[PDB]
Every structure is written in structure tokens, then in C-alpha cells.
Amino acid sequence: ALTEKTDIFESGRNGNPNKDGIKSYRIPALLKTDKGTLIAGADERRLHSSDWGDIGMVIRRSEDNGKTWGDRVTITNLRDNPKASDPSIGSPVNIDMVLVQDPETKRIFSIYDMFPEGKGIFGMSSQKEEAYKKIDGKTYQILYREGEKGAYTIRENGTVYTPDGKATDYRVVVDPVKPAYSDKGDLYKGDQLLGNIYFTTNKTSPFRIAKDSYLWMSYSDDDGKTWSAPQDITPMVKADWMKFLGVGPGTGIVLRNGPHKGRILIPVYTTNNVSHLDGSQSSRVIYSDDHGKTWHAGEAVNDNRQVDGQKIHSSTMNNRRAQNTESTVVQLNNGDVKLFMRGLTGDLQVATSKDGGVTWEKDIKRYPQVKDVYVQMSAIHTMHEGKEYIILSNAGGPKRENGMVHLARVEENGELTWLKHNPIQKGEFAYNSLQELGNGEYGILYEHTEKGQNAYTLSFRKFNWEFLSKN
Amino acid sequence: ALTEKTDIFESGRNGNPNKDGIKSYRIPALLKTDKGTLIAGADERRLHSSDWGDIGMVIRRSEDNGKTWGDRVTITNLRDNPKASDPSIGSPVNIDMVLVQDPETKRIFSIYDMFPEGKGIFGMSSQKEEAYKKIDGKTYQILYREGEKGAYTIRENGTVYTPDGKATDYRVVVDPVKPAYSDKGDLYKGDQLLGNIYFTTNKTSPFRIAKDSYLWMSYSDDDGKTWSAPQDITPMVKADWMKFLGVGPGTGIVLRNGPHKGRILIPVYTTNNVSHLDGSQSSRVIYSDDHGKTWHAGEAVNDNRQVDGQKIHSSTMNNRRAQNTESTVVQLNNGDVKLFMRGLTGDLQVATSKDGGVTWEKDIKRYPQVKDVYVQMSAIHTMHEGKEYIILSNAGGPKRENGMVHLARVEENGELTWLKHNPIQKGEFAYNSLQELGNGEYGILYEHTEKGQNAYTLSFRKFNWEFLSK
Ligand SMILES: CC(=O)N[C@H]1[C@H]([C@H](O)[C@H](O)CNNN)OC(C(=O)O)=C[C@@H]1O
Ligand SMILES: CC(=O)N[C@H]1[C@H]([C@H](O)[C@H](O)CNNN)OC(C(=O)O)=C[C@@H]1O
Ligand SMILES: [Cl-]
Ligand SMILES: [Cl-]
Numbered sequence: 001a002l003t004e005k006t007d008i009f010e011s012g013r014n015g016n017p018n019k020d021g022i023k024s025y026r027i028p029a030l031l032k033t034d035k036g037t038l039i040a041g042a043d044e045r046r047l048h049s050s051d052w053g054d055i056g057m058v059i060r061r062s063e064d065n066g067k068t069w070g071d072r073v074t075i076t077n078l079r080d081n082p083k084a085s086d087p088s089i090g091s092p093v094n095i096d097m098v099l100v101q102d103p104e105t106k107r108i109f110s111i112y113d114m115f116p117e118g119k120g121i122f123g124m125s126s127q128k129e130e131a132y133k134k135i136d137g138k139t140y141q142i143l144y145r146e147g148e149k150g151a152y153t154i155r156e157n158g159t160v161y162t163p164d165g166k167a168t169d170y171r172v173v174v175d176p177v178k179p180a181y182s183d184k185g186d187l188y189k190g191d192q193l194l195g196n197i198y199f200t201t202n203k204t205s206p207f208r209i210a211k212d213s214y215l216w217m218s219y220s221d222d223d224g225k226t227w228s229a230p231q232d233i234t235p236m237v238k239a240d241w242m243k244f245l246g247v248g249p250g251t252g253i254v255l256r257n258g259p260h261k262g263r264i265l266i267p268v269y270t271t272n273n274v275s276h277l278d279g280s281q282s283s284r285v286i287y288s289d290d291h292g293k294t295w296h297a298g299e300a301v302n303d304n305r306q307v308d309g310q311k312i313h314s315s316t317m318n319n320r321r322a323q324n325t326e327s328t329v330v331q332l333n334n335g336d337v338k339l340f341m342r343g344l345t346g347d348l349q350v351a352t353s354k355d356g357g358v359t360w361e362k363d364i365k366r367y368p369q370v371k372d373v374y375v376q377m378s379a380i381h382t383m384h385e386g387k388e389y390i391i392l393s394n395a396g397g398p399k400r401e402n403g404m405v406h407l408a409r410v411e412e413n414g415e416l417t418w419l420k421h422n423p424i425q426k427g428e429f430a431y432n433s434l435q436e437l438g439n440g441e442y443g444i445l446y447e448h449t450e451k452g453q454n455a456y457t458l459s460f461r462k463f464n465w466e467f468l469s470k471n
Numbered sequence: 472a473l474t475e476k477t478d479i480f481e482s483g484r485n486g487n488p489n490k491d492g493i494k495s496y497r498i499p500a501l502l503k504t505d506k507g508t509l510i511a512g513a514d515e516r517r518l519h520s521s522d523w524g525d526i527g528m529v530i531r532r533s534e535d536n537g538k539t540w541g542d543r544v545t546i547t548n549l550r551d552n553p554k555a556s557d558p559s560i561g562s563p564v565n566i567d568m569v570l571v572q573d574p575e576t577k578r579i580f581s582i583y584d585m586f587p588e589g590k591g592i593f594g595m596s597s598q599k600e601e602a603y604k605k606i607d608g609k610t611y612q613i614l615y616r617e618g619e620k621g622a623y624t625i626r627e628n629g630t631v632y633t634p635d636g637k638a639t640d641y642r643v644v645v646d647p648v649k650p651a652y653s654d655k656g657d658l659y660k661g662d663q664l665l666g667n668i669y670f671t672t673n674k675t676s677p678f679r680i681a682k683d684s685y686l687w688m689s690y691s692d693d694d695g696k697t698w699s700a701p702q703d704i705t706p707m708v709k710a711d712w713m714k715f716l717g718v719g720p721g722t723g724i725v726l727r728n729g730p731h732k733g734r735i736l737i738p739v740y741t742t743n744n745v746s747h748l749d750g751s752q753s754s755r756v757i758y759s760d761d762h763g764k765t766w767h768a769g770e771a772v773n774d775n776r777q778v779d780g781q782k783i784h785s786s787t788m789n790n791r792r793a794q795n796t797e798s799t800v801v802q803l804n805n806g807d808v809k810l811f812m813r814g815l816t817g818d819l820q821v822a823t824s825k826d827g828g829v830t831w832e833k834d835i836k837r838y839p840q841v842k843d844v845y846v847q848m849s850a851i852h853t854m855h856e857g858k859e860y861i862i863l864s865n866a867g868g869p870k871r872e873n874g875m876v877h878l879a880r881v882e883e884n885g886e887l888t889w890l891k892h893n894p895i896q897k898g899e900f901a902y903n904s905l906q907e908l909g910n911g912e913y914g915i916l917y918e919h920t921e922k923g924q925n926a927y928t929l930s931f932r933k934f935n936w937e938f939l940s941k
Contacts, residue, residue: 304600310598
């Protein structure tokens with residue numbers, strides 16, 4: 001009814017690197033593809049377990065429904081700053097992925113955060129730096145030069161232009177070719193490599209991008225064996241007021257019914273400049289209506305939301321309990337979209353959209369039957385014996401421990417009745433990602449430690465309806 | 472050398488309205504048009520002198536270089552909320568104008584602030600309310616309905632649509648036809664007038680716009696006799712992060728030389744959601760490269776500005792002395808644009824743009840030779856006997872009193888040499904607007920009170936080069 005765990009990404013022990021030189025794995029994502037393939041994604045956290053540093057976006061493929069797994073495939077790994085004083089924070093950062101496959105074109109997407117060198121979201125400045133500039137209808141990323149106020153631009157072929165629009169001898173590797181694309185951002189003057197635009201300290205080149213939070217996307221057209229170079233989708237979705245914008249990690253969905261069928265939905269969340277992490281974390285989705293070519297930001301669940309008699313907006317809010325952060329997204333048979341959002345109420349918070357994720361209904365439903373200890377969750381739509389269900393997994397608590405797989409029946413109004421709460425993993429348990437495997441079976445890739453393992457080891461289990469409906 | 476003052480807009484006395492029922496006039500703007508006409512614009516502040524209330528945008532015309540002035544022409548005056556608890560703050564607001572003429576099309580522009588019913592910039596909400604929505608490639612103004620979260624839209628012919636996109640029986644007067652366009656925003660259900668979308672309190676209709684700061688524009692193609700209906704240019708220039716966005720009042724310019732010759736520049740300034748009026752007031756300009764059809768926002772002077780070792784941005788700053796507010800804009804013969812900005816340093820602050828107002832150079836120059844007591848100023852380019860000068864007028868201090876007309880020589884390197892500091896008006900002196908009249912003559916329209924006059928009476932004077940070099 002519930003298989004034993006198979007380890008997919010194994011962290012080191014007792015604060016040490018593993019045999020591959022990796023201290024830590026985190027942030028699982030699991031995807032079943034059109035070919036029946038399982039794709040397991042993770043943060044490869046080389047130097048330590050914290051939310052920054054030298055981190056690669058990696059996947060593994062299984063062609064036998066989770067029995068055996070191939071080699072690690074690295075989607076993206078930016079090279080570290082070799083001259084940084086502190087290697088722990090000495091690398092441009094990728095962190096947190098969402099996986100999803102377009103069911104029509106089969107293109108598989110990995111969408112993830114990017115920061116230049118630093119402590120990621122924990123090192124973002126109080127002051128905004130413009131990251132892009134529109135010129136003659138074209139959007140270019142800005143470079144800043146030491147001692148100059150003006151905005152240089154990275155234009156066609158990675159050629160660097162002056163603030164007044166003159167071409168220079170400098171160029172940016174905007175079409176990386178090295179393994180893991182570790183050359184992306186490399187700054188050249190003609191033949192000579194001088195440094196990297198993603199470096200922030202002890203720089204050897206004169207140029208850096210704006211210190212900000214970024215969103216990147218890589219894709220695969222061959223069942224996840226090979227991946228495109230990173231695409232910077234930030235300017236398509238990030239508002240001027242947005243401070244942080246990152247994914248709510250795990251697995252996204254494609255709407256399968258209603259007038260927006262074919263729309264890809266990716267959970268995200270933002271902070272604003274008023275309260276940042278302290279009172280503005282706000283769930284929403286970005287979506288694509290053209291098979292991943294262009295992206296749009298939906299509205300926040302918190303936009304024009306009523307809280308204690310007064311309205312808030314995600315761009316201006318400062319309210320700790322009204323926050324909603326990482327989320328997981330589900331479409332019902334009636335066309336409604338449900339968003340299960342990590343929050344600070346201690347229990348499950350759910351938003352409902354009726355227009356395919358663009359806007360959200362006035363009331364955030366809370367379900368006290370399912371505990372939320374402030375940690376990522378995942379959820380999937382499912383059918384069984386003619387009825388509609390949602391399967392949701394997260395920590396049962398009180399800490400990030402005692403994993404649960406909860407089961408809800410989908411009622412007529414689109415409301416949820418919680419039926420079952422099944423423990424799946426004693427001990428530590430955190431981020432996780434669910435997928436239907438077919439033939440009444442289900443998959444889960446999740447964070448856990450035993451035997452002194454560094455946080456975390458990412459493990460895989462299978463289960464069926466006897467596990468979901470034990471009494 | 473300096474004429475006696477002629478009063479163009481006269482306030483009431485001792486807190487009373489004048490014979491027209493107007494307590495107060497404020498915010499002068501003065502324009503010499505292609506036909507030699509002087510256009511003098513003002514806030515007509517009926518109920519009081521405060522920065523809100525029932526305020527009409529009005530002008531007067533002079534065809535004899537300021538000797539005589541015609542009747543008042545009202546550009547725009549929105550109707551009050553008849554059910555407001557306090558009429559003092561009971562009206563949608565227009566406030567602060569900039570005048571400018573396109574020398575090629577001869578079209579005259581008036582650009583000014585708009586707020587729905589309330590205390591204007593001192594009455595903005597704490598939370599953002601989305602004002603616009605793009606639908607099928609079109610941008611529509613949003614309406615909010617009591618008890619509903621969703622965004623209604625005002626679409627074609629002013630027809631109101633639901634959040635889920637169905638037309639309703641409700642409509643907005645989007646083509647006002649009453650004098651002064653006082654019907655703009657009127658909300659109808661079929662034939663029945665129900666209220667106004669700009670009303671915020673004690674409403675009789677179900678709909679209102681977002682409580683926000685707006686930017687409107689009206690134009691005249693007949694030398695200022697008649698004016699178009701107000702055009703809402705806000706969504707062209709207002710970013711998502713901007714809280715307040717308004718004009719730096721007075722008279723804008725058209726670049727007369729360089730690669731951007733023909734560009735219209737309108738001084739504006741913003742606040743952000745971090746510190747608002749406390750530390751984020753940031754000067755910039757908006758510009759049009761197509762004779763006023765479309766507007767674009769240049770960058771703020773404060774964007775990527777170095778302050779105390781750290782860079783700031785107008786959207787995130789919280790720094791009182793680093794603020795810059797209402798400003799006046801001049802182009803030099805070398806093409807550089809100078810922006811003289813109201814501020815809190817006690818002295819004159821000047822920014823320089825080399826790309827026609829889009830971006831600003833690293834150092835804001837200060838001139839302690841010129842006092843700035845935190846009040847609007849005006850400045851104009853002028854040539855005299857082969858040389859380049861800038862004339863700048865403002866309060867000499869210590870309060871908004873002791874009006875001064877300063878004269879600077881523009882040196883070759885683009886630096887300014889202050890030669891003269893000429894008193895022009897003892898007693899109260901505040902906002903003012905300068906224009907070249909031709910033949911070594913100059914005009915100034917300015918705020919001043921005497922004899923118990925309410926703040927302010929807007930008066931006009933002429934002066935020449937014997938005055939500038941007294
Ligand atoms: C980009 C990033 O930093 N992602 C972090 C995420 C984030 O820091 C919080 O959502 C911020 N909110 N702080 N509570 O948190 C966690 C976490 O296990 O708790 C893991 C992610 O890798
Ligand atoms: C739209 C508006 O309110 N315009 C006001 C302007 C504004 O209030 C401040 O520049 C902002 N706050 N100033 N710190 O100030 C003044 C003033 O005489 O001082 C007159 C204008 O009519
Ligand atoms: Cl470098
Ligand atoms: Cl009303």
C-alpha cells in the first residue's frame with residue numbers, strides 16, 4: 001500500500017559533503033511526462049543547506065515508474081565568484097524550481113529564481129535598482145559600471161552599449177555553451193574574459209546587473225534529457241513595485257477544462273517595499289496562454305482583499321497574518337482553480353479563482369482539519385471510482401516533521417470535505433511534490449533526514465488507494 | 472524699469488469670498504503664445520485656500536501685452552458631492568497646472584492634477600487601489616462597487632462592464648458637454664442620473680474610481696478661448712509603484728535645439744509607498760515627442776542617485792533632505808536641460824540632463840547664493856546682447872515673502888554665474904511664473920497679499936534689463 005523509500009538525491013552527513021562534494025539537497029519537484037517518464041528535480045546545494053550559495057538546478061529521470069533512476073542532469077549552474085572572501089555567499093544563485101509539461105507541444109519547463117552573488121532573498125537591498133530599460137521597443141538588461149550613474153545595456157549578441165547608446169568592446173555571454181551553462185553572464189572585452197556580470201564583490205570586470213530578485217526559465221523538448229539555456233522571463237511578469245518575486249516550488253498545472261484550457265499555471269509569490277518578508281509575502285500565479293512563449297502575472301490573492309474591515313493590496317500591505325507565500329495549484333472539474341497557500345494561521349489556507357487564476361474570490365477559506373506549520377505543501381487533483389478528490393501532502397507538525405498525506409473529497413460548490421489524514425514519514429519532513437502515476441498509484445518526492453544526514457535527503461515513495469483510505 | 476502690479480485673479484478679504492464667491496486664487500502659470508497673447512492660468516479655489524476642495528482650472532487672456540485682461544475662461548471644474556458631510560473636502564479635485572504651447576501645431580496645453588472627492592494629496596488611501604485594466608489590448612478605467620471585490624470597467628461610450636465582462640445598464644459620462652465639463656464622471660442608469668464616479672462619501676450611485684492621484688490634460692487650438700474635454704493621461708506616465716504623481720506647476724518648455732528638438736517637457740514629481748510625503752518626493756519630467764499625442768515619463772533625478780554612500784531610488788527612498796519636489800525646466804543653447812527643484816536644503820538645487828530630460832547626471836548642484844525656503848519657483852532662458860542668461864524668480868525669505876528675481880549668466884561649460892538678486896515684491900510672495908515678452912521685456916505672474924487679502928491674489932508685473940541689472 002505504501003512502498004519503502006528510495007533515495008533520489010542524497011545529502012552528506014554530519015555537516016560534511018557527500019561523495020559528489022554536495023552537502024545538501026532541497027526543494028523537490030516531481031513530474032510525470034507524456035511518455036510516462038518521471039522527472040525528479042532539486043536544488044543541488046553544494047556548500048551548505050542555507051537559502052543561498054553555490055546551487056545548481058538538477059533533475060533525475062526514471063523510465064520505470066520510480067524503480068530505477070538515471071544520472072543527475074544539471075539544468076543550470078552558474079559559476080561561483082572565485083575571488084569572493086566568503087565562499088558560502090560567494091556565488092550567483094539559482095534556487096526553487098517549478099516543473100510542468102505542456103500537454104500539446106510536450107515542451108517541459110523548469111522555472112526558478114535567480115540572484116546575483118549574495119545571500120539571495122536575505123541580502124536584497126532596501127533600495128531598488130532598475131534591472132531593464134526599454135529602447136526603441138526592445139527591452140534590454142541594464143549593466144552598472146563602477147563610478148558611473150548611467151545605465152549601460154546588454155543588447156543584440158550580448159554587445160554592451162553605453163548609457164548614450166554607443167557600442168563598446170565589451171560583450172556578455174548571452175548564449176552560454178559550457179556544461180550547466182556556467183559561462184552565462186561572463187564578461188568579455190574582445191578575446192579576454194574579465195569576470196561575470198552576476199558577481200558583486202571583488203569584481204574583475206567593470207560591470208554588474210542590478211541587485212534584484214529574478215525569475216528564470218529553462219526548457220526541454222526531449223523528455224528532460226537536455227535543457228535550453230536559461231531564459232530571463234523576469235520583465236514579462238515582474239511589476240515595478242515588486243521586491244522579491246519567486247516561484248512556489250513543486251509542480252505546476254495546465255488547465256484541462258473551461259474557456260482557458262491549455263493555460264499553464266505557475267505558483268509564485270512576492271514581497272513589496274513597505275514590509276518585505278515581514279508583512280507582504282503574497283501568493284499568486286503567472287500563466288502562459290501560448291505554450292510557454294510569453295508569461296503574464298495574475299493578480300494577487302491579497303489584492304483588494306478585506307482584512308479586519310480594511311482592504312490591503314500586495315504592493316502596499318504590512319500585515320503578518322494576511323501573508324500567503326509558497327503555494328500549490330489545482331483545477332477542479334467545474335473549472336474553478338484552488339490555491340493552497342503556505343501561511344501563518346497554523347492551518348490550511350485556500351484561495352479560489354473562477355477566471356483561470358487571473359483573480360481570486362473574496363474569501364480565503366481556512367480548514368482547521370489540516371495543520372500548516374509554515375512550510376511548503378503540494379496538492380493534486382484526482383479521480384477515483386467516479387468521484388473527485390484532492391490529495392495534499394505536508395508536515396503534520398508540530399515542527400517540520402511527521403509527514404502527512406491528507407485526502408479531500410470535492411463537493412458540488414467546489415468546497416472540500418476532508419476525509420483522511422495518513423502519515424507517510426516519521427521524523428523530519430518538509431518540502432514535497434505529488435504526482436498521479438496511473439493505475440490507482442501515486443508518487444511523492446520529499447525532504448527527510450535520518451542517520452545524521454544533512455538537510456535534506458530527497459526520497460521517493462509510491463502509494464495506492466488502500467493507503468489513502470486506511471481507517 | 473518695473474511696472475506697478477495689475478491684479479489678474481483677486482482673492483476675497485478677511486476670510487470672506489470675493490464678489491464671485493471665490494475665497495482664494497493660487498498657483499499662477501503664465502504663457503506667451505505664438506500670436507503674442509498672454510495666457511494667465513490659476514487654481515480658482517472657491518471655498519478656501521487649502522490644497523483641496525472645489526477648484527476650477529481657469530485662465531485669462533491679454534492681447535495688449537498685459538495692459539488689459541479679458542473674462543475668465545474655465546477649462547475644467549468638476550461638480551461637488553452635494554451630499555458631502557463637509558463641503559470643504561466634499562468635491563473631486565483639480566489642482567496645480569502647467570501651460571505650454573507646441574510652436575509647430577500652435578496647440579496650447581494645460582496639464583494638472585486630479586483627485587476624486589477628499590483632501591487631495593493629504594487624503595490618499597493607505598493601500599493601493601488599481602486604477603486601470605488592460606482588456607483585449609485596450610486600457611480601461613476601473614470602477615469599484617460597494618461589497619464587491621472585483622474590478623468593473625468603463626468601456627466604449629462609457630458603458631460599465633462587470634468584473635466578468637458583461638455590459639450593464641450603468642454608464643459614465645465620458646464625453647462631458649456641460650460648461651466647464653462639470654458632468655464628467657456622472658453615473659447614469661439608463662436615463663436616470665444617480666451620482667458621480669468621483670464621489671467617495673455618502674454616495675447615491677454604486678460606483679467610484681480608485682482613490683488615487685491622477686494626471687489630466689486639456690488643450691486649446693484657438694489661442695486659449697475654448698478648451699477640449701479633459702484627457703486622462705495618467706496610464707501613460709504613472710508607474711505601478713507611484714503613489715502621488717503631479718505637475719510641478721508653472722510653464723513647461725519645448726526644446727528648441729538638439730536631437731530632441733520639438734520635445735515638450737512637463738515638470739512633475741512623485742511620492743512612493745514607503746515614505747510618501749515624508750521622504751520620497753522626487754522631481755522628474757514627462758515628455759511628448761509627438762506634439763502632445765502621447766506622453767512618456769523620464770527617470771527621476773533621484774534614481775540611482777548617490778546619497779550618503781548608498782544609492783537610492785525614487786520608488787524606495789526614505790530621506791527627507793534627499794527629496795526634490797516641484798520644479799522648473801530650462802534648455803541651454805548647448806542642448807543641456809536644467810531642472811531647478813524645490814527642496815529642503817535651504818538653497819537652490821539644480822539637476823542636469825544631457826538626453827533631453829530622460830536621465831539626470833550624477834551631481835545635483837547647489838547654489839547658496841539663492842535662497843530656497845521650500846516653495847515653487849520659475850526660471851526661463853533668455854538671450855541678451857549675444858550672451859546666454861537664466862532668469863529665476865522665487866521667495867527671498869525668510870518666509871514666503873520678499874520676492875526676488877535672480878539673474879544668472881550661463882557660462883560656456885554650462886555652469887551658472889549668479890550676477891544679480893533683485894527684489895521685486897516686499898511682503899508675501901510665493902508661487903510665480905515668468906515669461907519673455909520680447910524686446911528686452913519680461914512678465915511675471917505671482918502670488919501676493921495686501922490689505923487683508925486671502926491667500927493669494929495673483930498679480931502681474933512687467934520688467935526690463937535695467938531692472939535685471941539695476
Ligand atoms: C528563495 C528562498 O529563499 N526560498 C526559500 C524559502 C523562502 O526563504 C521563504 O519562503 C521566505 N519566507 N520566510 N519565511 O524558504 C524555504 C524554507 O524551507 O522555509 C526554502 C526556500 O528555498
Ligand atoms: C497637489 C498639491 O497638494 N499641491 C500643493 C503642493 C504640495 O502639497 C506639496 O508640494 C507636497 N507636499 N509638500 N511637502 O504644495 C503647495 C504649497 O504651497 O506648498 C501647493 C500646491 O497646491
Ligand atoms: Cl566581475
Ligand atoms: Cl455617487
